[PDB]
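Q: How would the structure tokens look for this protein?
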Amino acid sequence: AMVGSQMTRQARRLYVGNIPFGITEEAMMDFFNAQMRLGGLTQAPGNPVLAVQINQDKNFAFLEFRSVDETTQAMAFDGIIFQGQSLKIRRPHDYQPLPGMSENPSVYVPGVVSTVVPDSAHKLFIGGLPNYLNDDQVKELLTSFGPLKAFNLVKDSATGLSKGYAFCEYVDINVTDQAIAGLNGMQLGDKKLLVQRASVGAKNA
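A: Here is the predicted structure in token form.
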């Protein structure tokens, strides 16, 4: 091509800084490829990095990814220390990344507990749930302290079954910490149910 593919060129490519002058394609490539695997960012198998571009006599480089969604998550490493190296990634405002959020259908009934739990500052995570119980059955355990405005149990589309974890939000803010106080550690059946505020950094900081 000639003067084409400009949008996706800079959209799949991020600005890498805080690099040592003389760093090689393979060096930076393998590092990021590994991190994606570690953080569970790699949505596709293999290497997320497609091509590494180092401008001559410049103290910076550019990393091109096969997918923009795999690109944007590399930007999360901006200011992070991986294995002693500090990575700096700048956000190119020549394009717009689309958030990887799947829109919820009307799978809830207005006037009752909603199956959509927003990521509030009172976001709650429940784990340890028996596979033979769904959100409705599990509500009985949570409702012991207070009712839920929203309770969504994440089931697996491949199993058709409850993975054993859900997210809730209590209608009142006082019952939030009062419920998690007693519910967390509930030894039901074979499992102790984990009940924890997800607003502390749910498997990611």
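The two ends are 41 Å apart (CA to CA).

The longest strand covers residues 162-170.

Upvote if useful.
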